[PDB]
Amino acid sequence: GKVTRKIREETKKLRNPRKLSSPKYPNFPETTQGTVVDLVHERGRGVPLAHVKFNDEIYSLIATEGLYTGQTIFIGDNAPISIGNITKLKNVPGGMAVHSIEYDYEDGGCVGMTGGAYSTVVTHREETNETVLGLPSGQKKIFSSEVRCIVGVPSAGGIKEKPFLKASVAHYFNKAHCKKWPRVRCVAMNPVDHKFGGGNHQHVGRPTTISKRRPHAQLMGLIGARRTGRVK
Amino acid sequence: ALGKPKQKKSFVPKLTKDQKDEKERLITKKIYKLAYAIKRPPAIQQFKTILESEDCKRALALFSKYKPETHEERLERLKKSNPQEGPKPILAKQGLRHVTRLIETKKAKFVLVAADVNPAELVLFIPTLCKKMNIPYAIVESQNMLGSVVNMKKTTILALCDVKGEDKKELEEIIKISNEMFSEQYEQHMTRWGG
RNA sequence: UACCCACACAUGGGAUCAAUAGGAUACCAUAACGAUGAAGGUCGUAAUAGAAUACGAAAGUAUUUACCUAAUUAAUAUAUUAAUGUAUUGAUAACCCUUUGAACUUAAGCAUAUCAUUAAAAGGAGGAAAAGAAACUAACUAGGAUUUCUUUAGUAGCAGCGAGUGAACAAGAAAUAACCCUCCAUUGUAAUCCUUAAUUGGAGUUGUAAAUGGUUUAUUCUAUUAAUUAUUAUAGAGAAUAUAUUCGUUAUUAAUAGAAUAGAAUAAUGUACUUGAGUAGAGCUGCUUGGUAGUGCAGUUUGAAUAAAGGUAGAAUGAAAUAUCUAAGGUUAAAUAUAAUGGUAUACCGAUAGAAAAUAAGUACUGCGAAGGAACUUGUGAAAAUGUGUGGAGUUUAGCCUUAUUUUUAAGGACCCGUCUUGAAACACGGACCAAGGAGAUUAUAAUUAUAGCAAGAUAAAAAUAAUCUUUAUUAACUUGAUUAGUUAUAAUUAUAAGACCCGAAACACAGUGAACUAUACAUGUUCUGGUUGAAGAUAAGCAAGUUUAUUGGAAGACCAUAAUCAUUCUGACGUGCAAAUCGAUGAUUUAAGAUGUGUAUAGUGGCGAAAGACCAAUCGAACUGUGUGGUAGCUGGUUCACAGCGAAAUGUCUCUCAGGACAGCAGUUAUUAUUAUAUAGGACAUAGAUGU
RNA sequence: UAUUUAGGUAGCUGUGCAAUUUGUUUGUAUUGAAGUAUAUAUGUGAGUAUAUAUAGAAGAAACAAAUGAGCCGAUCUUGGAGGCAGUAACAAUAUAUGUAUAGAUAUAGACUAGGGUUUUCAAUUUAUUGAAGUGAAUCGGUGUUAUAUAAAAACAAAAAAGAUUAAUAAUUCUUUAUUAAAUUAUUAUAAGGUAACUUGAUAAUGACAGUAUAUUUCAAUAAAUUUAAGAUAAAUGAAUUAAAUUUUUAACUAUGGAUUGUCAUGAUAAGAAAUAGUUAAUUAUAUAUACUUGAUAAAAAUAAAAUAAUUUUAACCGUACCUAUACCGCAUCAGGUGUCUUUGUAUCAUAACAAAUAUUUUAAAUUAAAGUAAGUAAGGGAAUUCGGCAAAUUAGAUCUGUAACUUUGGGAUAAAGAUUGGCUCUAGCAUGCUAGAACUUUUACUAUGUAAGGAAUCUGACUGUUUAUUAAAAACAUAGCUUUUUGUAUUUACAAGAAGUGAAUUCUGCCCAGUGCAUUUGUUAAAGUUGUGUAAGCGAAUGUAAACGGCGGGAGUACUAUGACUCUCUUAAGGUAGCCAAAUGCCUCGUCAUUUAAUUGGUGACGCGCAUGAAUGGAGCAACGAGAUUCCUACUGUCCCUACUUACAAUUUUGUGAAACCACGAGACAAGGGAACGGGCUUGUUAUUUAUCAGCGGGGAAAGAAGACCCUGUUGAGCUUGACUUUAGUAUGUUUUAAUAAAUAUUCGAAUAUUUAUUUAUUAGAAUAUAUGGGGAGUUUGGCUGGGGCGGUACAGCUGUUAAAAAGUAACACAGC
Ligand SMILES: [Mg+2]
Ligand SMILES: [Mg+2]
Ligand SMILES: [Mg+2]
Ligand SMILES: [Mg+2]
Ligand SMILES: [Mg+2]
Ligand SMILES: [Mg+2]
Ligand SMILES: [Mg+2]
Ligand SMILES: [Mg+2]
Ligand SMILES: [Mg+2]
Ligand SMILES: [Mg+2]
Ligand SMILES: [Mg+2]
Ligand SMILES: [Mg+2]
Ligand SMILES: [Mg+2]
Ligand SMILES: [Mg+2]
Ligand SMILES: [Mg+2]
Ligand SMILES: [Mg+2]
Ligand SMILES: [Mg+2]
Ligand SMILES: [Mg+2]
Ligand SMILES: [Mg+2]
Ligand SMILES: [Mg+2]
Ligand SMILES: [Mg+2]
Ligand SMILES: [Mg+2]
Ligand SMILES: [Mg+2]
Ligand SMILES: [Mg+2]
Ligand SMILES: [Mg+2]
Ligand SMILES: [Mg+2]
Ligand SMILES: [Mg+2]
Ligand SMILES: [Mg+2]
Ligand SMILES: [Mg+2]
Ligand SMILES: [Mg+2]
Ligand SMILES: [Mg+2]
Ligand SMILES: [Mg+2]
Ligand SMILES: [Mg+2]
Ligand SMILES: [Mg+2]
Ligand SMILES: [Mg+2]
Ligand SMILES: [Mg+2]
Ligand SMILES: [Mg+2]
Ligand SMILES: [Mg+2]
Ligand SMILES: [Mg+2]
Ligand SMILES: [Mg+2]
Ligand SMILES: [Mg+2]
Ligand SMILES: [Mg+2]
Ligand SMILES: [Mg+2]
Ligand SMILES: [Mg+2]
Ligand SMILES: [Mg+2]
Ligand SMILES: [Mg+2]
Ligand SMILES: [Mg+2]
Ligand SMILES: [Mg+2]
Ligand SMILES: [Mg+2]
Ligand SMILES: [Mg+2]
Ligand SMILES: [Mg+2]
Ligand SMILES: [Mg+2]
Ligand SMILES: [Mg+2]
Ligand SMILES: [Mg+2]
Ligand SMILES: [Mg+2]
Ligand SMILES: [Mg+2]
Ligand SMILES: [Mg+2]
Ligand SMILES: [Mg+2]
Ligand SMILES: [Mg+2]
Ligand SMILES: [Mg+2]
Ligand SMILES: [Mg+2]
Ligand SMILES: [Mg+2]
Ligand SMILES: [Mg+2]
Ligand SMILES: [Mg+2]
Ligand SMILES: [Mg+2]
Ligand SMILES: [Mg+2]
Ligand SMILES: [Mg+2]
Ligand SMILES: [Mg+2]
Ligand SMILES: [Mg+2]
Ligand SMILES: [Mg+2]
Ligand SMILES: [Mg+2]
Ligand SMILES: [Mg+2]
Ligand SMILES: [Mg+2]
């Protein structure tokens, strides 16, 4: 046969990988004050970024919900908690919304980068100095304290309301996000290109649930499912 | 081939004359924290006694009485008709491969050993060999100090065969302070595990 | 007038015969490149210059040497004080030493095996290279470093024990040669070593030690230049001119360079007790060899003794006697193998032959590229195919055989050759016509027949002036044992292996070139004109929380045309075409998921794809160029002179056998011998019998 | 002394002729060798010898030797030359005197890619030879970069006229300018305005989408005037052509204190109108507003300034010519190839015609047939045909009028009617547009351009794309719906990978026995230790069908008939909601109705459905379609049944001048036998213009291509998998792993194992064993046979008959083991 589509797409990512910003905030020993300068828009991502200014140095950050040009925010380990400020994790009471959490201390940020997605805090445990967070995916993860984070819900709202009612709307989405579009179903192909292909009618003939035990080039279909079907 | 990009070649800078000396400092610093924390064998632990800084000066002031001839003196010594005129002169030997012949034939009377040598295996057997032939021995710090007598750069070992009559009493003063540091406590030096 | 025949004279073409500043094979000598700038390329120089050929601004006849090119104001390293000095880099197409490493093919299939310790590919040196002074061979009355030839030997042995593959000692020769470091080298003295005009500056005791004179004379050998040679002859090898002369041959000298031997003279002579460790060997694992249960090598784990010691002795382990040697550091001549370059010879070819090339030939010309690659000598003037003149027949019959002076007619006979085939003139295949070329030859090993030399023995083995066969005497072995005249050569036939009588596949592996056509992503530019319809938003006038009427406004993957683009129908035209996909009418299409120039990225078990197995230079269900390669074919086609003697089978058995093989039968050739005529017979008669149509 | 023997395919043996070279012996030739062409003799035959003509330098015989040693064929190799045949196929403007007067066809001109002397002139006849010709401080390259080799169209110091040459000209010459660098002469270091700002008095940028509307800058039209030109038998308030001269708004400042604008949306107590003033007005590739987006629309080199003057100061390379008869397709090829400019009439345009510019020389004709195009047709109107294939009808613009259905937007320009010229006026205001009226005629969008209409069924939602060269579609895509994996992403779950169906509306039933997938507690290798013990995986349990898939049969029971109801084999469950002789129904041209004079067609109903059925999706049509099918109206040479006219090829002449094919073809037939369909063989019947010309398609089983269909070969290749043998990747053991101290467990003071802490190590791997493993790699997949396949084994043994009185003998023949 020939090399299929999945392996040929990953080696096309090594010839020209996709490029993004990775915005991080600095670290400062005591509480300082900074000003918001302007709001911009990037090519790949939907959430707008913000340029703040600490000690006559301009950095880049993800914009929170209510933010206007010229406003003042504070950064430090013991800043007061309000909209757009960045404090330590232990100060916030249970029930609020944070949107950039570093895994360890003195890191930029790891969790909650996209627009419209936020996390919640559920508790504090004074023994061993740990707090449990509620991830946007729905899983409870235990975080160590003394990491610092930003208070508020991120901007850009709910983008998934109105559909791509035309085909032309989805053309410019996948082109900016560097994905392959359109896609051909694997049953329509000839049996050289794909395992499911060929035949006299369009059907599969093999079970579509494939274990994870098998090697890398044999993985296709619903890989390693614990369940299949509508629940009710 | 196979749709993979061409291989990429990185660059390196050549090290500057400050950068070479800087990196060699962090190599010798790491070793000095290493060798102390582990336990070293007893045969190396005996090489820590330097006897003093001050008591070295009495022995080197003895050996400078007996220096060998220079190169230019050696040719003028052969310009004379008879090369051997008078008695045999008393000298000081300075070689490692020659001194262990003298101790094995029991000719020597006083041996000085430099503990400065790297690699260290060359002089590990010296204090035990003098013990079997009843020779007094001593340890000085640097091999540059022994080369200062024989007008050489570095010298590992140094020993005398005999001395003159006038410095006889000056020699017996040295051996008493040398023996109470090493040979009277030799059986303790084998047992001490450095840790 | 046309058609046919006979004769004579002229066109067309380059066959035959004769020549030759060209090739092919074998042997001998040489075995000389490059940072002091190589091999190769591009551009220029002639008084009147294009091809070829020679040469660099000193340029078409002992120095110079334009510009690229390892191409270098560099790179990887060492020494001295960022600068200076030293060494390496590129070319090869034969022989040599390492690394990596296939498949076609044979087994009548194929998978272990064979082709093969091969081809392709990479690294490293010299005129030769590699090897080389026993941790050997043997069982004798014992031999003695390496290399090469003969022989042992197609043997012992290895292997689906099938096809097939395959060594050594002893014996006869060519050529000969042995040595040096590693300790404590006379410690009455580093006595050594590099560099500088200079103990000048260093190195070195963690150990360095290194005697020196090229003057002269004589002899021999090799290579290159220059000179003299009778017309009798140390010269009859051969060329050139015309129908008796020269160059040379033969035989002698000189000059330059190189090598070897000998003599004379000049320089020079102390002391020296070293023996090889992460090695040898074990356990697991993979390759290699004839090596069989290591013959040799390597990865991982583990890892000794020091001459009171260690290794080896053709089934395995353990033990014992008897022999015989001492590993793990270094150098080495001769006998041997083969190109580029120059010579000498020959039972080789003689212009469709010999090299692709008798050389304006690796040239003209082709391909995007890797690459592919011809014709033409000088005299004589054959056949095929035509022209002119003279003579002759008839219009109902080409050519051939027999018999006839009615021979440009008459009577009889007579379908076109080669080939497979039970059977061909066949409506079975090949062949329009002439010339030249064109297919069972060579080698190794066996056997039979004819001939020659010697014969209980036979012989040109390598070399220089021994072995083998008769005859391994049998057997697995022990126990035992006389006997069919041979051996060396010359010639013909047959069998097996070599490209193997000649030409012919679809395929497989190794090493390389292409995105100028066409596909996708990224960056940067350019992209004619007119109409139709009427969503949000906004304003007024009426009726009375709102609700009718009229304007303004100009959204949409909305509607329609020109220029530009595509390809539904006529199954129109054309169909040795205008054209290896075109032309005409009719149709579909419009601000976008469009069209298009240039630049960068993607390569053949790989890429790109709104998916038809479509496209990747007129080629795609695995592109193109060179090599292994004269790949294998139980299958089609062809196979060259006369006469004479003799003359078949299409049947039985076995076979992964049914389009093929082997054994038996039928045939031919040669040979020896007579009561095996006191004998035989696809017969008859007399006698004795078998049988179940 | 053959009175005896003599044919012969495959095949075996003997005696002889031809060619090239080698050793020895004998001999020929310039009064003429070898070769070649005609005769004669001789030999049974391969062959030999001599004679005559031509030519000009070497060749023959005997005894022995070495082989590249004798052609009719191979769709044999190379060269030369025939028939068909002067045949097919192409080219062919007028003048009695001319460097002119006319006719005819074609839009034309500049930069780049490609070509390389084709440019110009002279001499000799789209040729040959020989000279001459390309001039740069301001026109291109050389410079910067596109997130470790990139731009002659992106960015960047600066010029234009007017003339000269046989050919160069933003380059030569004249006139007026501009940039940069080096040397000279001179010098302000600040004033003024309340403010916006003015004058020598630094620190700025290169630099960035698309569409719509409003400005009418230029330019162009139109008018007037002034010089000039060309024509008409005549006539005309003075026609036609050429050149030039002319035809207030936006920001900001000071007073002011509440209104005001645009074609549209508005602006203002963060100060409107009205005044006074300071800056500018970007030249159509511009300015100001508005609109569409899960698309917001590149990089880097690059900076200073006042006035006058000077210069053997500004380097290197290309500058001719062609835009299709000077490129690519083997060519002087009806094909293909980036960008720009181009005059006049043309009441929406389009189409068409004319300007401008470039090329071009001489056969015949009222007459063939059959062709390739263009026209017309009395009466009938689809009767032709698989089918209205081809042609015909309709059409622009103004006014009335507009249905069923619906996803409420559409359907719709639905359908159906009426009007249209020319001239003379009247009436509106926006001044070149629109209504009405009178007069008149062989009646008016129609030269060119320009929708036939209606009623139903199947299938796809729509715009879109695809087999370059026989398939444009019902195939692919798409939004919409659903399932699954990942919390250690250069990117961070509204994100990143993997799959199925296919807009909206309405629905999505039952089964986990089989195969897969996930989760959790009997069998099984090696290495190590005195000895012993310990792996994953397989097996078992529990979930899962918008995972692969599946969804029965028989008997009685209420005048006949049927079975609501009952009984019964088993299984994982026994096809529910729906739908149909449908693109899915063999019997089959099913049964009934309707459409027609007549129907295997179409539509509506029926269902024990060979073999319908639910995201392998079921049911359904509003809008859309060069998709497939049937019927009405109009229309017509498709037909009844054909007829007439013109052009181009053809028939006739001159010039250039081929190919396929060819065993022999010299006249053709009836029957016979034959390899079972003769041009030739055997018996019969027969043609003939002095040797022709133009047609036609009965035959030569006519020509193209070593048949693609079928079979054989111990010949191949692409593809799949529960075929045979293995392998990359990956999972799990054992051994190697820095030291130290302590705790705990298991075995007997000791040996193992587990776990914690510190820093003194920490490049991150190596050697073996078991399992998984069509993601890959090699190769195989018998024979006989009334063709092969399916069926049987007549493929090994035994008995009786076939089998014909010794022995021997066939059939997918008989009866059996
Ligand atoms: Mg398909
Ligand atoms: Mg596959
Ligand atoms: Mg489907
Ligand atoms: Mg071969
Ligand atoms: Mg085989
Ligand atoms: Mg074979
Ligand atoms: Mg085979
Ligand atoms: Mg091998
Ligand atoms: Mg040699
Ligand atoms: Mg050597
Ligand atoms: Mg071998
Ligand atoms: Mg020494
Ligand atoms: Mg002479
Ligand atoms: Mg030894
Ligand atoms: Mg010849
Ligand atoms: Mg030749
Ligand atoms: Mg006859
Ligand atoms: Mg036959
Ligand atoms: Mg026939
Ligand atoms: Mg035939
Ligand atoms: Mg033929
Ligand atoms: Mg011949
Ligand atoms: Mg071949
Ligand atoms: Mg390859
Ligand atoms: Mg549209
Ligand atoms: Mg056609
Ligand atoms: Mg390549
Ligand atoms: Mg297909
Ligand atoms: Mg192609
Ligand atoms: Mg006979
Ligand atoms: Mg045959
Ligand atoms: Mg036989
Ligand atoms: Mg009888
Ligand atoms: Mg005969
Ligand atoms: Mg021959
Ligand atoms: Mg011939
Ligand atoms: Mg023949
Ligand atoms: Mg020919
Ligand atoms: Mg013509
Ligand atoms: Mg010319
Ligand atoms: Mg010009
Ligand atoms: Mg000019
Ligand atoms: Mg020019
Ligand atoms: Mg020009
Ligand atoms: Mg062009
Ligand atoms: Mg053309
Ligand atoms: Mg006519
Ligand atoms: Mg009519
Ligand atoms: Mg009529
Ligand atoms: Mg009909
Ligand atoms: Mg009919
Ligand atoms: Mg039609
Ligand atoms: Mg009117
Ligand atoms: Mg569609
Ligand atoms: Mg097509
Ligand atoms: Mg279409
Ligand atoms: Mg088509
Ligand atoms: Mg589809
Ligand atoms: Mg749906
Ligand atoms: Mg299950
Ligand atoms: Mg369920
Ligand atoms: Mg039902
Ligand atoms: Mg239906
Ligand atoms: Mg009917
Ligand atoms: Mg004509
Ligand atoms: Mg007949
Ligand atoms: Mg018949
Ligand atoms: Mg005719
Ligand atoms: Mg055939
Ligand atoms: Mg067979
Ligand atoms: Mg195969
Ligand atoms: Mg396979
Ligand atoms: Mg068969």
Say yes or no: Cβ of A41 under 7 A from any atom of strand D.
Answer: yes
Beta strand A49-53 with A58-62 is antiparallel
Residue with tokens 């925010």: A73
Residue of A nearest to B7 (CA): A15
Say yes or no: Cβ of A15 under 7 A from any atom of strand C: yes
Label residue A158 left, alpha or beta by phi (over 0 means left) and psi (-120 to 50 means alpha): beta
CA–C1' A191–D727 (A): 23
Cα dihedral value A199, A205, A207, A208, nearest 10: 30
PDB experimental method: cryo-EM
Closest CA to B51 of B114, B118, B124, B100: B114
CA distance B130 to B136: 7
List all residues 6 or more positions away from B141 whose beta carbon is below 8 Å from its beta carbon: B50, B56, B114, B115, B116
Question: What are φ and ψ of residue B93, in 5° steps?
Answer: -85, 155
Overall resolution, Å: 3.4
First CA to last CA across chain A, in angstroms?
41
Side chain identity at residue A160, one-letter code: K
DSSP label at residue B156: S
Name A157's Cβ contacts closer than 8 Å, sequence gap at least 6. Answer: A115, A116
* Residue whose structure tokens are 């919900």: A65
Report CA(B2)–C1'(C630) in Å, whole number: 39
* Residues 6+ positions from A84 with CB-CB distance below 8 Å: A64, A66, A67, A71, A73, A150, A151, A152
Q: Within chain B, how many helices (H) and strands (E) appear?
A: 9, 4
Cβ of B91 less than 7 A from strand C: yes
B110-114, strands of its sheet edge to edge: B92-93, B157-160, B110-114, B137-140
Q: Which residues of B touch A8 (CB under 8 A)?
A: 3
Compute the 3-state secondary structure of chain A and give helix, strand, coil in percent, each to the nearest 5.
10, 25, 65
Listed in order, strand segments (DSSP E) in chain A are 32-40, 49-53, 58-62, 72-75, 86-88, 97-98, 119-121, 130-134, 140-144, 148-150, 209-210, 222-223
Our CA angle for B168, B171, B174, nearest 5°, is 160
Distances (CA, A) of A219 to A8, A192, A211: 14, 16, 8
Contact of B5 with B157, CB cutoff 8 Å: no
Q: Does B5 lie at the interface with A, CB-CB under 8 angstroms?
A: yes
**Please, are residues B113 and B56 in contact by the beta-carbon 8 Å criterion?**
no
Q: Is A110 left (phi over 0), alpha (psi -120 to 50) or beta?
A: alpha
Phi/psi at A58 (5° precision): -100, 125
CA-to-C1' span, A94 to D659 (A) = 101
Q: Which residues, 6 or more positions from B125, have their beta carbon under 8 angstroms from its beta carbon?
A: none
Q: How many angstroms separate the CA of residue B1 from the nearest CA in chain A?
A: 11
Residue for token pair 């395992």:
A195
For residue B41, whether the previous peptide bond is cis, meaning omega lies within 30 degrees of 0, is no
Chosen for mutation from A2, A10, A15, A16 (greatest number of chain B CBs closer than 10 Å) is A15
What is the whole-number distance in angstroms between the Cα of residue B14 and the centre of ligand 45?
Answer: 57
